[PDB]
Design a protein around this ligand. Structure first.
Ligand code: ATP
Ligand code: GSH
Ligand code: GSH
Ligand code: JAA
Ligand code: MG
Lengths: 569, 214, 214
C-alpha cells in the first residue's frame, strides 16, 4: 500500500543495505535458479562460502551472439527453459545489434515487481518534491497496444506492453499514479497513431486535475507537441460537433470515442483564442494544464538534444529526469528528482539484480578485473555488466556510465552516452540500406499525403510456407487502404539485389507482408532502450528481426493498422 | 535561368518538372491562373495558351512530351532517357504516344464524367493499365535500362491514382498491381519526389470539378 | 530490306513512304486489309493494329511520325531531316504535333463530316492553313534548308488538298497559294511524285467512305 515516508525509510535502509541486498539479490537469483545448464558448464551448485568469489572466478562473460541461440531455443517450438530457467512469459530485443543481429532476453513476473516498486518509490520521492492531487489525473503518452504470440506459440515481449496488459499493472499502479486519461482499449488500440491523437485528446480532456505531462522521452513529448502544432484545429473540430474525425477508423476505439462525445460548440472559442495567442508555441505545456508541477522523462544522454525543443515546449516548467532501468535488468532511481536534467542522476537500488562494472581506467579500454558497485570509483567511467532475473548473468550490455556521487551508501550515476556502437556482419538485412530504401521507395506514396516516414523495422517468418518478410513502418498520419497495398507491393519491389529477386520471383520464400504500424511504436523502442539498465549507449534500432529479436516484436502484430500481403506476385 | 509556366494539377506540367529535375537543372516555377494567362505565356503560345512551357534563351518550348525531349537534348551529357538504338527510341515515343491517347482520355472520363460515360472510361483505364502492365513486364522502368523517356510520361499520372480509386470506387491494383507498384518505385527519384503535388489535394481538385459539373 | 505495312490512301503512310524514298533506302511496300489484317501487322502491333509500321533488323516501328524519326535516326548520313540545334528540331516537333492533331482533326472534319461540323471545320482548316502559312514566314520547306521533317508530315495532305477543296467548297490556293504551291514545289520531288497517290484516287476514296458511313 503506497505511502511516502515509510517506503523511503525502507529505501534509505535498503540503499545503505546496498551490500547485504546486492549479495542477497545474488543468493536469490541462483537459489531460485540453481538449475541453469549455462551454469553447469560453469560448475555451479549454490550455497557454499565462497559463493560470490566462485561466481566472479568461474563464469565467463557472454555476448549478444553467444546469448542469442539459448533464448532462441526458448521461443520457437521448443518451449524449453535454459540460461535462467522458466520458459518465460515474454522475451526481448536489444538496442544496437548482435553482430548486426537479434538478441533475445527473458521476462518474468519478478521484473514486474521490480517495476512497481521502482515506481512507488520513484513516485514517492517525486511527489515529495513535486506533490500531486490524489483526485486528479495525468497526461501520459503511454501505449502498449500490441501483443503477439511467438512462432513457438509462446508470448514474447516488450517492456511497456508486458507492463500494461499484465494482470497486476492495473491493481498495483492504481495507488501510485493519477488515473490515466485514456480508456485502456485506446491505450491498447489496434491503431496507435490515431490513439496518440486520442491520447492528446484524452490527456487534454481532464486537464485541470492533471499534475504532469508524461513521456518516457522528451522526443516522445516533442513528437506529441509538434504533432499538436499540426492538428490542433482538427482536434477542435473533432470533439466539437460531437463527431470524432473521419481519420478515426478502427471500430473499438471509434466506439470508445463516441462513448465520450456529444455536440458541444462553446469550447472552440476558448481553445482557438489561447492557441493563436502564443509565440511559435513556446510554453505550450503550462499553457495546456497550467497546474502541472512537472514535465517528466529521461533527460540525460542521447536525448539531451530533445531537452531544448521540449524546453521550448515546457516553457518555464521544471523538467524532471526519469530513472534508469529495464527488462534486461533495472538499475537506478532518482530520489532527488528536483535536480536539473544536465545534473540529473539515478541511484542504484540493490535488489535489482547483480551488477559488476568494467572500468575504463587505463586508456581505452584497459584490461582490469571487475570491482563491486560500492567498490566503483567516483568520477570514473565504467561499463555496466549485468546479472538479473531476465536471462542475464554477469552479461556485457556494453555501455559506459560515470559515478558523480553517493546517496548515502549507494553510488549515483551519470549518462553521457548514446550508442553501444560497434556492430558486426548481419543476415536479417536484405541489405539494411535496401530495407530502409524499400521503406522510403514505397513510402512517398504516403508522402503524397503530406507526410514523411518517421521510422521503420522488419522481421522474418519461417513458421509459414513459404516463409515471409514482414515490414513495419511508423508514419505521421492515417491513409486509405489502396495505397497501403500499393505500398506493400513496393517493399516487395524495393530490394535491388539479385537474390531476393530469385526467391520471391520463384516463390520459395514468401511474398513480403507490410504490416504498417502506428506512431510512437519505435519511440517505444527508443524510450524503453535508453532508460534500459546499463548506460545510454542504446539508441540504435536494429532494423530487421531474425526469430531471435523480440522487444520490437511485441509492438509488431496487434497494431496492424494495416497488414497487407502483396496482390502482386 | 529556365522559367517554367506550370499549373499544380497538370500531369503534363509534372512531366516537365520531373523532366527538368531528372537531368539536374535548377529552375524557377511559375503558377498559372488560367483565368488570367500571364503576358509571357500568351506570348509563348498565343492560341493554345497551354502549359507546361519552358523559356530558354528567351525561347518558349511548349507541349509536355515535347518539353522532355527538349530536356534531353538541351543537356546531352549525363542522364539520357532514350537508349542508343533508333528503334528503342521509336519504342519509347510509341508507348509515350500510348500514354497520350486512350489512357489520358480514359482517366479524364473516370474522374471527370459519370454514369454511362463513367463505365466506358472505367473499362478503358483497366485495359489501358493492363496492356501497360504487360509492356512493363520486367523492366524497372520503360524507355531505357534506367529512368527513361516515358518513365517521365506516366509517372506523373500516379498522383491521380487516389482520385481514380475514389470516384471510380475502384482499386486499380488488384487487377494490375505491378504498375502503381512501379509508380511509387519511381517516386524515389527526386525528379518526381519533389515535382508532384499532394494527391489528396488532387483528389480535392477533381472533387471541385465533380461538384461543379453535375 | 525493310517491310512497310501501309494503307494507300493513308496520309500518315505517305509520310513514311516519303521518309524512306527521300532517304535513298530500298524497301518492300505492303498493303494492309483492315478487314483481314496480315500476320505481321498483328504480330507487330498487338494493341492498335494501325499503320504504318516498318520492320527492320527484326524490329517493328509504328506510327507515321515515329517511323519518320526512325527513318532519320537509322540513316543519318545523306539527307538529315532535322536541324542540328535542338531548338529547331523542337519547333519542328510541336509543329509536327500541330499538323498531327488540330489540323488533322480539322481536315477530317472537312472530308469526313457534314452539316454544322463540315462548316466549323472549314473555318478551322482555313485558319489552320493560315497559321501554317504564317509559320513559314514564307519559307520553302519546314524542317531543313532542304526537304524537312514537318514538310514530310504535311506534304501527304497535299494529295487530299483536292479533297478539301472538293468537299469543303474552298480553294486553299486562292486563299493560301503558298501552301498548295509549297506542296507543288515538293511535287518535283520523286519523294512526293511517287509516294503520294493520285489526287483522283483519293477524292474518289473520300467519297467512297462517304457512301459507307452515315
Ligand atoms: N525500464 C523499464 N521499463 C518498462 N518496463 C520495465 C522496465 N524495467 C523492468 N520492466 C519490467 O520488465 C517487465 C516486462 O518487461 P519485459 O521484461 O517483459 O520484456 P522482456 O520480455 O524481458 O524484454 P524487453 O522489455 O527488453 O522487451 C515488466 O514487468 C516491466 O515492468
Ligand atoms: N499535350 C499537352 C496537354 C496539356 C493540356 O491539355 N493542358 C491543360 C491542362 S488540363 C491546360 O494547360 N489547360 C489550360 C487551361 O485549362 O486553361 C501536354 O501534355 O503538355
Ligand atoms: N498515330 C497513328 C494513328 C493512325 C491512324 O489512325 N491510322 C489509320 C490509317 S488511315 C489506321 O490505322 N486506322 C485503323 C482503323 O481504321 O481503326 C498514325 O499516325 O499512324
Ligand atoms: C521500472 C518501471 C518500468 C516502467 C518504467 C517506464 C515508465 O513509466 C517511464 C520509462 C520507464 C522505464 C524506466 O524507468 O526505465
Ligand atoms: Mg520484447
Amino acid at each position: 500500500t503506497f505511502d511516502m515516508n515509510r517506503v523511503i525509510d525502507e529505501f534509505d535502509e535498503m540503499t545503505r543495505n546496498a551490500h547485504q541486498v546486492q549479495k542477497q539479490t545474488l543468493k536469490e537469483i541462483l537459489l531460485k535458479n540453481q538449475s541453469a545448464i549455462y551454469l553447469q558448464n560453469c560448475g555451479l551448485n549454490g550455497n557454499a562460502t565462497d559463493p560470490e568469489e566462485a561466481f566472479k572466478s568461474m563464469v565467463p562473460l557472454v555476448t549478444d551472439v553467444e546469448l542469442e541461440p539459448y533464448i532462441k531455443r526458448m521461443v520457437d517450438g521448443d518451449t524449453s527453459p535454459i540460461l535462467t530457467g522458466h520458459p518465460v512469459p515474454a522475451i526481448s530485443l536489444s538496442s544496437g545489434t548482435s553482430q548486426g543481429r537479434p538478441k533475445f532476453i527473458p521476462f518474468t513476473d519478478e521484473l514486474m515487481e521490480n517495476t512497481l516498486q521502482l515506481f512507488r518509490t520513484a513516485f514517492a520521492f517525486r511527489n515529495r518534491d513535486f506533490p500531486i492531487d490524489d483526485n486528479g489525473k495525468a497526461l501520459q503518452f503511454i501505449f502498449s497496444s500490441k501483443q503477439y504470440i511467438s512462432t513457438g506459440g509462446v508470448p514474447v515481449g516488450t517492456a511497456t506492453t508486458n507492463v500494461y496488459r499484465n494482470p497486476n499493472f492495473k491493481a498495483g499502479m492504481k495507488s501510485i499514479t493519477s488515473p490515466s486519461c485514456s480508456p485502456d482499449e485506446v491505450i491498447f488500440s489496434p491503431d496507435v497513431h490515431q490513439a496518440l491523437y486520442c491520447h492528446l485528446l484524452s490527456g487534454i480532456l481532464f486537464r485541470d486535475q492533471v499534475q504532469y505531462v508524461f513521456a518516457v522521452f522528451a522526443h516522445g513529448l516533442v513528437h506529441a507537441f509538434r504533432t499538436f502544432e499540426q492538428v490542433w484545429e482538427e482536434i477542435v473540430t473533432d470533439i466539437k460537433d460531437g463527431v470524432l474525425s473521419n481519420r478515426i477508423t478502427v471500430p473499438s476505439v471509434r466506439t470508445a470515442m463516441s462513448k465520450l462525445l456529444t455536440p458541444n460548440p462553446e469550447l472552440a472559442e476558448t481553445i482557438r483564442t489561447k492557441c493563436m495567442s502564443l509565440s511559435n508555441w513556446y510554453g505550450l505545456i503550462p499553457a495546456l494544464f497550467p497546474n502541472a508541477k512537472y514535465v517528466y522523462g529521461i533527460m540525460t544522454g542521447s536525448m539531451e538534444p530533445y531537452v531544448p525543443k521540449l524546453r521550448h515546449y515546457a516553457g518555464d516548467l521544471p523538467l524532471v529526469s526519469h530513472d534508469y532501468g529495464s527488462s534486461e535488468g533495472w538499475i537506478a532511481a532518482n530520489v532527488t528528482p528536483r535536480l536539473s536534467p544536465e545534473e540529473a542522476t539515478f541511484a542504484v537500488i540493490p535488489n535489482l539484480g547483480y551488477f559488476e562494472f568494467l572500468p575504463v581506467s587505463e586508456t581505452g579500454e584497459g584490461e582490469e578485473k571487475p570491482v563491486g558497485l560500492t567498490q566503483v570509483k567516483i568520477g570514473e567511467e565504467y561499463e555496466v555488466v549485468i546479472t538479473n532475473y531476465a536471462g542475464l548473468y554477469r552479461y556485457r550490455l556494453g555501455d559506459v556510465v560515470k559515478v558523480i556521487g553517493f546517496y548515502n551508501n549507494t553510488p549515483q550515476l551519470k549518462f553521457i552516452c548514446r550508442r553501444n556502437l560497434i556492430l558486426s556482419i548481419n543476415i536479417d538485412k536484405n541489405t539494411e540500406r535496401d530495407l530502409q530504401l524499400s521503406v522510403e521507395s514505397a513510402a512517398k506514396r504516403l508522402s503524397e499525403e503530406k507526410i514523411e516516414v518517421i521510422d521503420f523495422s522488419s522481421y522474418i517468418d519461417v513458421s509459414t510456407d513459404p516463409g515471409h518478410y514482414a515490414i513495419f513502418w511508423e508514419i505521421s498520419g492515417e491513409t486509405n487502404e489502396d495505397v497501403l497495398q500499393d505500398c506493400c507491393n513496393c517493399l516487395d519491389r524495393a530490394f535491388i539485389d539479385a537474390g531476393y529477386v530469385s526467391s520471391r520471383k520463384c516463390k520459395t520464400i514468401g511474398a513480403l507482408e507490410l504490416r504498417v504500424v502506428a506512431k510512437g511504436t519505435f519511440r517505444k523502442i527508443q524510450e524503453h532502450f535508453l532508460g534500459l539498465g546499463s548506460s545510454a549507449g542504446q539508441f540504435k534500432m536494429p532494423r530487421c528481426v531474425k526469430p531471435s529479436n523480440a522487444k520490437v516484436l511485441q509492438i509488431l502484430c496487434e497494431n496492424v493498422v494495416s497488414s497487407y500481403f502483396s496482390t502482386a506476385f | 535561368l529556365p522559367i517554367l509556366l506550370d499549373y499544380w494539377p497538370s500531369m503534363f506540367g509534372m512531366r516537365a518538372r520531373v523532366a527538368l529535375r531528372e537531368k539536374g537543372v535548377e529552375f524557377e516555377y511559375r503558377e498559372e491562373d488560367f483565368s488570367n494567362k500571364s503576358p509571357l505565356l500568351l506570348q509563348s503560345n498565343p492560341i493554345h495558351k497551354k502549359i507546361p512551357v519552358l523559356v530558354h534563351n528567351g525561347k518558349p518550348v511548349c507541349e509536355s512530351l515535347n518539353v522532355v525531349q527538349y530536356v534531353d537534348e538541351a543537356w546531352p551529357e549525363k542522364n539520357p532517357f532514350f537508349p542508343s538504338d533508333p528503334y528503342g527510341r521509336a519504342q519509347a515515343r510509341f508507348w509515350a504516344d500510348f500514354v497520350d491517347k486512350k489512357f489520358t482520355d480514359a482517366q479524364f472520363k473516370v474522374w471527370g464524367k459519370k454514369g454511362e460515360e463513367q463505365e466506358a472510361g472505367k473499362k478503358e483505364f483497366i485495359e489501358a493499365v493492363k496492356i501497360l502492365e504487360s509492356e512493363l513486364g520486367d523492366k524497372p522502368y520503360f524507355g531505357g535500362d534506367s529512368f527513361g523517356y516515358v518513365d517521365i510520361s506516366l509517372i506523373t499520372f500516379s498522383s491521380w491514382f487516389q482520385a481514380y480509386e475514389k470516384f471510380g470506387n475502384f482499386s486499380i491494383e488488384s487487377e494490375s498491381p505491378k504498375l502503381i507498384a512501379w509508380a511509387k518505385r519511381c517516386m524515389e527519384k527526386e525528379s518526381v519526389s519533389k515535382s508532384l503535388p499532394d494527391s489528396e489535394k488532387i483528389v480535392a481538385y477533381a472533387a471541385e470539378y465533380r461538384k461543379n459539373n453535375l
